[PDB]
Amino acid sequence: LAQQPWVEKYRPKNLDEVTAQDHAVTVLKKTLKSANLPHMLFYGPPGTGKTSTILALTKELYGPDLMKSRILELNASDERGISIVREKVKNFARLTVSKPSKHDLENYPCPPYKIIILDEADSMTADAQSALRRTMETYSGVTRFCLICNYVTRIIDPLASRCSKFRFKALDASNAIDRLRFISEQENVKCDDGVLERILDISAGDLRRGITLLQSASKGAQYLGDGKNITSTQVEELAGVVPHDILIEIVEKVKSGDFDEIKKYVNTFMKSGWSAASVVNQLHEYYITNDNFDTNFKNQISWLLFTTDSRLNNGTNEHIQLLNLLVKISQL
Amino acid sequence: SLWVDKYRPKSLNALSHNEELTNFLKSLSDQPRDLPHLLLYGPNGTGKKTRCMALLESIFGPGVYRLKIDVRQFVTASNRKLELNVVSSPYHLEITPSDMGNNDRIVIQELLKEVAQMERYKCVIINEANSLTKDAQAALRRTMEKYSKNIRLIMVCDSMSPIIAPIKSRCLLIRCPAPSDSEISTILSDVVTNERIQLETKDILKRIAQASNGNLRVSLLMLESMALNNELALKSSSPIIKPDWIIVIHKLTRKIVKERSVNSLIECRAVLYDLLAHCIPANIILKELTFSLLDVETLNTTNKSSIIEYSSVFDERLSLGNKAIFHLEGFIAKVMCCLD
Amino acid sequence: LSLQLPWVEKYRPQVLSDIVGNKETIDRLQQIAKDGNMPHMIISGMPGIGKTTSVHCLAHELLGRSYADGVLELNASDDRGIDVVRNQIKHFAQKKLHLPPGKHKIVILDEADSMTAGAQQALRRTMELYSNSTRFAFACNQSNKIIEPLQSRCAILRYSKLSDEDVLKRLLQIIKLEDVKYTNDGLEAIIFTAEGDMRQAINNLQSTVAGHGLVNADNVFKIVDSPHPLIVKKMLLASNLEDSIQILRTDLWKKGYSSIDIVTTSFRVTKNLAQVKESVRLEMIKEIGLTHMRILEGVGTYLQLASMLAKIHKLNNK
Amino acid sequence: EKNIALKPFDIAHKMLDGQIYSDIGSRNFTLNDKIALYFDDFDFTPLMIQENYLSTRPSVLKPGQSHLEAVAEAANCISLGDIVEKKIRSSEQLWSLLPLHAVLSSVYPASKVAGHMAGRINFTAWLGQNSKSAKYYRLLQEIHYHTRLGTSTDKIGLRLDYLPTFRKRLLDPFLKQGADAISSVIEVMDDYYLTKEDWDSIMEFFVGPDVTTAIIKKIPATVKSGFTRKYNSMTHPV
Amino acid sequence: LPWVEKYRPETLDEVYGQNEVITTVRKFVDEGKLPHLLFYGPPGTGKTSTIVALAREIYGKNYSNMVLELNASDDRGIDVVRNQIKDFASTRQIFSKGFKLIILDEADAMTNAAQNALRRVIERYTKNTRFCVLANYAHKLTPALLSRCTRFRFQPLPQEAIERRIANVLVHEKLKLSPNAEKALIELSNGDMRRVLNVLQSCKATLDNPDEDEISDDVIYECCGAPRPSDLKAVLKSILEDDWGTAHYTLNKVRSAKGLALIDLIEGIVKILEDYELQNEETRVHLLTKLADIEYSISKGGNDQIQGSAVIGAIKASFENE
Numbered sequence A: 001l002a003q004q005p006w007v008e009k010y011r012p013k014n015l016d017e018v019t020a021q022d023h024a025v026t027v028l029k030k031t032l033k034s035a036n037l038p039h040m041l042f043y044g045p046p047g048t049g050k051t052s053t054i055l056a057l058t059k060e061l062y063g064p065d066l067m068k069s070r071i072l073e074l075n076a077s078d079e080r081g082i083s084i085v086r087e088k089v090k091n092f093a094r095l096t097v098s099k100p101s102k103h104d105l106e107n108y109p110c111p112p113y114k115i116i117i118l119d120e121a122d123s124m125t126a127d128a129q130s131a132l133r134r135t136m137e138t139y140s141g142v143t144r145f146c147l148i149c150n151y152v153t154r155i156i157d158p159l160a161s162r163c164s165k166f167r168f169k170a171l172d173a174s175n176a177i178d179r180l181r182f183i184s185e186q187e188n189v190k191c192d193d194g195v196l197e198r199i200l201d202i203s204a205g206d207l208r209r210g211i212t213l214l215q216s217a218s219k220g221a222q223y224l225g226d227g228k229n230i231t232s233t234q235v236e237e238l239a240g241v242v243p244h245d246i247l248i249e250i251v252e253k254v255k256s257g258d259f260d261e262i263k264k265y266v267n268t269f270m271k272s273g274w275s276a277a278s279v280v281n282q283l284h285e286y287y288i289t290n291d292n293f294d295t296n297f298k299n300q301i302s303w304l305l306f307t308t309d310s311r312l313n314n315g316t317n318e319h320i321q322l323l324n325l326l327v328k329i330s331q332l
Numbered sequence B: 001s002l003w004v005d006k007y008r009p010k011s012l013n014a015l016s017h018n019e020e021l022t023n024f025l026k027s028l029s030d031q032p033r034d035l036p037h038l039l040l041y042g043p044n045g046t047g048k049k050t051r052c053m054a055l056l057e058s059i060f061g062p063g064v065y066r067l068k069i070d071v072r073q074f075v076t077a078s079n080r081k082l083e084l085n086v087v088s089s090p091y092h093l094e095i096t097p098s099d100m101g102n103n104d105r106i107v108i109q110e111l112l113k114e115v116a117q118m119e120r121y122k123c124v125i126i127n128e129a130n131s132l133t134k135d136a137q138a139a140l141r142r143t144m145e146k147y148s149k150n151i152r153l154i155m156v157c158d159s160m161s162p163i164i165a166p167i168k169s170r171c172l173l174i175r176c177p178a179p180s181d182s183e184i185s186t187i188l189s190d191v192v193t194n195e196r197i198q199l200e201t202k203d204i205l206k207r208i209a210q211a212s213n214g215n216l217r218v219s220l221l222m223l224e225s226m227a228l229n230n231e232l233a234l235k236s237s238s239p240i241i242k243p244d245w246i247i248v249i250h251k252l253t254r255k256i257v258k259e260r261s262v263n264s265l266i267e268c269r270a271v272l273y274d275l276l277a278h279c280i281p282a283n284i285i286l287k288e289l290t291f292s293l294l295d296v297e298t299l300n301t302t303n304k305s306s307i308i309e310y311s312s313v314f315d316e317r318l319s320l321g322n323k324a325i326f327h328l329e330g331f332i333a334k335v336m337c338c339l340d
Numbered sequence C: 001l002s003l004q005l006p007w008v009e010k011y012r013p014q015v016l017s018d019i020v021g022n023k024e025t026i027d028r029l030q031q032i033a034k035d036g037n038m039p040h041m042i043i044s045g046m047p048g049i050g051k052t053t054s055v056h057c058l059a060h061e062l063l064g065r066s067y068a069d070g071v072l073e074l075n076a077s078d079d080r081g082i083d084v085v086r087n088q089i090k091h092f093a094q095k096k097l098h099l100p101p102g103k104h105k106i107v108i109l110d111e112a113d114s115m116t117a118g119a120q121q122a123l124r125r126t127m128e129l130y131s132n133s134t135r136f137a138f139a140c141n142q143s144n145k146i147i148e149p150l151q152s153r154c155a156i157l158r159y160s161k162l163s164d165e166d167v168l169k170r171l172l173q174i175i176k177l178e179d180v181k182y183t184n185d186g187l188e189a190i191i192f193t194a195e196g197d198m199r200q201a202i203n204n205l206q207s208t209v210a211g212h213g214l215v216n217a218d219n220v221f222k223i224v225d226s227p228h229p230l231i232v233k234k235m236l237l238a239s240n241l242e243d244s245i246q247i248l249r250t251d252l253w254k255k256g257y258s259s260i261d262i263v264t265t266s267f268r269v270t271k272n273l274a275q276v277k278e279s280v281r282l283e284m285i286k287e288i289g290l291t292h293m294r295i296l297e298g299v300g301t302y303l304q305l306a307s308m309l310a311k312i313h314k315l316n317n318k
Numbered sequence D: 001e002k003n004i005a006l007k008p009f010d011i012a013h014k015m016l017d018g019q020i021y022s023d024i025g026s027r028n029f030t031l032n033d034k035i036a037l038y039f040d041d042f043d044f045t046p047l048m049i050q051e052n053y054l055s056t057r058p059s060v061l062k063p064g065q066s067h068l069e070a071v072a073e074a075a076n077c078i079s080l081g082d083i084v085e086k087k088i089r090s091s092e093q094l095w096s097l098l099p100l101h102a103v104l105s106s107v108y109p110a111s112k113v114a115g116h117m118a119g120r121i122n123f124t125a126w127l128g129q130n131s132k133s134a135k136y137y138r139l140l141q142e143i144h145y146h147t148r149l150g151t152s153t154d155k156i157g158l159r160l161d162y163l164p165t166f167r168k169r170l171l172d173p174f175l176k177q178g179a180d181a182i183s184s185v186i187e188v189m190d191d192y193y194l195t196k197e198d199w200d201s202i203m204e205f206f207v208g209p210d211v212t213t214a215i216i217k218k219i220p221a222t223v224k225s226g227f228t229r230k231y232n233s234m235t236h237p238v
Numbered sequence E: 001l002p003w004v005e006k007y008r009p010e011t012l013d014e015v016y017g018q019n020e021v022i023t024t025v026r027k028f029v030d031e032g033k034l035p036h037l038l039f040y041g042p043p044g045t046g047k048t049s050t051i052v053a054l055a056r057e058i059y060g061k062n063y064s065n066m067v068l069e070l071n072a073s074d075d076r077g078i079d080v081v082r083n084q085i086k087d088f089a090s091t092r093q094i095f096s097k098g099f100k101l102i103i104l105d106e107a108d109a110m111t112n113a114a115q116n117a118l119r120r121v122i123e124r125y126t127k128n129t130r131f132c133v134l135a136n137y138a139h140k141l142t143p144a145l146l147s148r149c150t151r152f153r154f155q156p157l158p159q160e161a162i163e164r165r166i167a168n169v170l171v172h173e174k175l176k177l178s179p180n181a182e183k184a185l186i187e188l189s190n191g192d193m194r195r196v197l198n199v200l201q202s203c204k205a206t207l208d209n210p211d212e213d214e215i216s217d218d219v220i221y222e223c224c225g226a227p228r229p230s231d232l233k234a235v236l237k238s239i240l241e242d243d244w245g246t247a248h249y250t251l252n253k254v255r256s257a258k259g260l261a262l263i264d265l266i267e268g269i270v271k272i273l274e275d276y277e278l279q280n281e282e283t284r285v286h287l288l289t290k291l292a293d294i295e296y297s298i299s300k301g302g303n304d305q306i307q308g309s310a311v312i313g314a315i316k317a318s319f320e321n322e
């Protein structure tokens, strides 16, 4: 069968199918009306439609047949380093431009340049970005670069000045939930009430991660029998999210303040296999956004959680770090 | 052979604990063609490798257990000639790329490309996936994308946190909690009935399960050791047998608690040197020492809080250092100062 | 127009007696040159101290006229490839060249620790095959990274950073040979700037002589590209944190000085603060080194320098 | 020639002297001199300082401070210096951090525990222990390679969990049954492809009350001769 | 054509100062003690003008035969540039006896291996070839290359000179710039004229009417991709005055909608907090230490939301000391 990830399967085909990015789509349409396409810089929250919009613009520029030959898609973060990305760009640019057919010429403008798309460009180092700017300058005649990133401020000024910048607003919760609901109905995914909302909350509004999690949950539902509905516990299990009941129990154990009880609970918690980083993140979310704690408690707990997260990021023993974090909070 | 290996379940039907996971694996094996990439995470000695082998047996057959071991030689950059022990079967492969240190990415790439070219599909089991370098994980993601047609990865790790998000998105997260004490007691009861071991009461199995802290492998080996010492007749008064390194660490904890001085620190250094030289990992030593110190009944809350804080600090330092004895001695000295 | 002969190149050591530091290693090399029959040796030490220069002087003493073709220098981490440099070594070893009976051809390898297993074994085999006429000298930073079979065949020599006395002696010799007008404070400033770096000290001396003619502290500091030690001392010893941050912002960050230069000059100045107790100096040095390590890891921002100043001020007030 | 090996001893003895850290002694022997002392034989100075900093009688103790607090601070600084050294000697090649490593590993702990050497300056034992650990890790890797097809564990798990039971199944029967247990021991070895060399290596991994040197020595030579003769007289799986 | 090449200082007159470097190199040449020179500093200070003036003075009519001008950022490759250097060194002329000068612009862009190879080439051809190395930052070069090259530092241009050059560019290109936009551009460029020219050219291109429209500060900040001071001030005010929930929401919303990285937000907030009048030194000590720790942890990865809340808590806790 034609198995395909739901993220790429449900990408909008044309610019008119982008839902909430009115400003960026309008500016891109105005630029497309002009015969000249400048270098583009797409920035905004993750999962807003940057890649979808650039692919739709490429489709409208070239045609479904020519766009595959005229496009090189790279990920500067997942790649080995600067050398691989820049050599691939050089090889793509040096390659002869594919000749459009009569149908492509008579149906689409088919501009004489090829578009190179970089994903997660902000993750590049300053030297990598300077090398990318030099490569763009060298081959600016026949290639136009579109940089996709989450933070425009992570891109150096010399590279950013060469690119016209388009800002994508964060998707509204209603729009994201409607998109997820439409995707689920088309794929015949039985979802219980609040499952899509839970998926969006876990993904933190990232529609890409939400669609990926929905597809993963659908696959799991096939394996489990009885044809039952997908429930929030299943998506929490698939996303590696500790259940809220365990978090409440951790909070109560911290509140009681007994060192031995906290140590015993952490010992019995590590046997369940739940990730310690997820516990730290959920504890941060619970405590910071809680109206029952005063300013001083949150001031101390923010530093405590920051220290625990920094120590966990170094590849340490989760049990010791979690026990230390829970003991320190109970003393506040 | 040892009872831990003789009575290991060789099929999905032979599993006795975590029935939901067994049902999930049985459902997975019913559709071999669309088998996803798997990532199993949980505490050590809970049965992850056994479950992976049982799933492989359910998919391919009993021939997965006909295992042969070979050494593959790889010529890397600057002509570094490497050896990797690859446990292979006519249906699957098992690798531990973390044994190659920082050269895991190139070994993974070369071997996975070779396996894909040699090929419905061949399953590759990667042990200690959490200890793979990030470059190795990126190479694994690349091989997953390129060779998903002929390669199905089954990654086993104790914690999924070091795993990168791109790997998690393309793999099925499977959580394997440690068995409860009742399930461990049932397994040990089956083992002792198979081996015809006399029991004064069933509470001995409960004590063994409690002493193993949910580690099924440790519980089985402890039961075998206790049975051998008691002439195949376990009594209610039979002491729980602990490994040599655990006994040494407990003795060190008692010594640290009893006397806090520079000479005691020197003798603790000697004990730590003895432990490290005999293939006891530094992180294991630190964790065991910390959790033995926290179990002393003569220490108050302040002492235990200081101990756990110093343990966290020096665990971070161990993960970022080279010479482990330095950090272990620093932690012991800080604990001695806090107790005094 | 004529030939250009910089002081750093003109006054580089040629004979073994021209080397100032490392008295024990220099004595060993002098003995080896005296009795001939240069054994295979491995010289190890921190990079930049001129390890290859000593063996070059030894080769000059041993061979003399035949130094032009009897000595081959190569880098083990050459971009051309390990195979091609091994082939070049083999071609040099097989090259026929008449020599006095008590001398042998010398092969000098730089960054030998970068070689991995297999390459080192092949080099050991090549050395054993042609040990009758060719001797090998390996220069590396970490001697432990060289395989045991190579270490056993070779004699280990350890090279260390030059002390301030050796730098002062070399500078005085150069000044006497060049009739340079100088003051004691100027030489003190030059030695302070160059922490055992003989080449940097000679370059700074030459630049000071050319720019101003008289070598004093003011002219040396004007020539030296590092931040002025007086400014760094004022920043470190300021009683008020606002004053320290203002001095930093106005005089070091806005003057184009990089964070690396700032932390290096702070480390140099703190060592010589005789007015401060050594315990406080050690605490300040620890903080400066921590921020230097943070900078070398890729942060290198102004906020790190501000935090370093804040911690130093916190230490000062006790 | 022996002066080269004596140099780290002299450096460690001089750096741990409490006279050069007093107010008067600091002026005569400044911090630059101590950093230079580090930079003479910088390979062994941190090791010697870490080895010998617990053998002093501190004369530089602050009021209200005990010897144990000083050694704790010295150990903290030593571990920080070890982290710095790991960062220096890695592929990053951060050789500009050598003075920082000097201060963190040699000078600061010495300042903390400076005094009179209560005993003798001992050479660092970390090198021999590191070599011993490497040898035992190679032996454990060989044993794990031999027994991988029978045991479901990694190398560390094999050391921590399997080895005590292997000791109970391979050495304990000789103590109670003598030569009558040779067949059972060989049968257990055959199930895991364990050679006699592996049997010898396994008994060397035990510490504390489980040491087997005296126990093996106490075994009659006839029992060992019969064991090796029976092992050599039959073929084994491979 | 790029505006960087235009208005470039072509002679020593266009250079604001730094005649000391010219005089020292002239004395080196006269005395026969010319070393391998390394000129580093911000672009536009006059390194290229100084070196070409020195070469023209030394050689004269045979400038094209005795000078090789190379740019290390051309990205052609290590082998090709090494071959170029070797064939330039080997093409000795009897009628043109004398050392040959090689100029390498933007050498800091090279990789470490390329820099080591360049240093080896410099050592090999030091008998008859003199190397001049141009870089933006000296700390980016390898220590092996730095030791063999005499270092000359070019100080950043004074603000008055930058303003004069900006006014000259504006009157040449008929561009009208707001004073606030000029201040923002000068602050962002940080003494680099290349950034000024590039940003001005890009802003002129983006203008709908590049002849009858004035560039605002918002346009400059959008072109440079830099955090606007208004957003940072709003975030700081929300953190200092509002409660924890409001501060957290404001910080997340501002730094996600505007695409401001947490490290850049920290840098901007630290820059703003410099001008604050604090009655207690402990406030500044805690602020600096905690913010530096957070930034260093950010450089290694970690949880983004946790680090943002850590920033909020660090700022809130320090100001409790007034």
Ligand SMILES: Nc1nc2c(ncn2[C@@H]2O[C@H](COP(=O)(O)OP(=O)(O)O)[C@@H](O)[C@H]2O)c(=O)[nH]1
Pocket: B004, B005, B007, B008, B009, B014, B015, B016, B017, B043, B044, B045, B046, B047, B048, B049, B050, B051, B156, B187, B216, B217, D152, D153
């Ligand atoms: N009887 C029985 N034994 C089990 C079961 N699961 C695990 N074990 C035992 O647990 C031991 C260790 O499991 P292991 O494969 O090492 O799991 P892992 O190391 O955590 O991935 C094996 O030797 C098995 O004998 C089960 O369901 N039933």
Ligand SMILES: Nc1ncnc2c1ncn2[C@@H]1O[C@H](COP(=O)(O)OP(=O)(O)O)[C@@H](O)[C@H]1O
Pocket: A006, A007, A008, A009, A010, A011, A012, A017, A018, A019, A020, A021, A045, A046, A047, A048, A049, A050, A051, A052, A053, A148, A179, A207, A208, A211
């Ligand atoms: N404005 C939008 N309208 C419809 N779908 C969207 C929109 N934005 C994102 N999506 C969905 O997100 C998925 C891919 O997101 P993507 O564009 O890759 O995120 P990013 O913005 O990080 O590139 C697509 O399947 C698409 O359906």
